[PDB]
Amino acid sequence: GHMQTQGLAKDAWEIPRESLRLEVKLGQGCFGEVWMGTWNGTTRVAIKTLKPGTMSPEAFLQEAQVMKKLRHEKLVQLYAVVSEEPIYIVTEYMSKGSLLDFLKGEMGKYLRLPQLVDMAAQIASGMAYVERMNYVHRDLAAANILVGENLVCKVADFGLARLPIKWTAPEAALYGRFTIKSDVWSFGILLTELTTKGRVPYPGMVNREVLDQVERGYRMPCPPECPESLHDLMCQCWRKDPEERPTFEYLQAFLEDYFTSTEPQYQPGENL
């Protein structure tokens, strides 16, 4: 009847550190760690912390800011934050960990092309949302994709997202030209991770050899049992000119319709 209209300028994110409870350590990087815990003892959550004197507390909070502006079912959802050191970033908890570990774990060996292409579609949808919001991820890879119940996949790690050479587009790694298109290149590399059970891209090739090679026009071959049509999509993602590469909007549609429109004769196999 009579709605509250006053006192709404309150920060819908900030919360008291006392309401948090870090339980299990799930991750650890250069600028902090990730823990699983409870938000007010009743909500299981994920908390990304920061290692003191490893990054400006102001810079760290940037990933939090981006996450305040971006909302989508295929993006990890931010729940709350603690902007005062020790700084904490609270988000929904993804039960199956990173896509990378899922792929090379025991439950990954049973995955086949239909599930794998579907996951790519989910990721593409997430990136499509980022795409239309005029943002760039800069670090799209399997290690930065989170998996949840029912194999839902969500883009995470927007630490370096604003308005690793084996995953980075040439122009981006060489001249710092990070765009949604250098992100499309990354998705292409990600597609190889999905079709090889998480194998590292460019097998047997060191970082410096990779740059030389890709500049000389080298591109990874079609993975074993991977339909040539899918490899062709990867090659479109790795086109030299960033503007030749497809949009995530295009990729999302292509993958969602894959098995009826592109690979109608698909038949199961030993690994894909």
Ligand SMILES: CC(C)(C)n1[nH+]c(-c2ccc(Cl)cc2)c2c(N)ncnc21
């Ligand atoms: C590294 C790993 C796989 C343990 N990890 N990292 C995050 C994560 C937490 C906060 C932000 Cl802001 C971004 C990602 C995460 C999560 N929510 N749920 C499960 N595992 C997670």
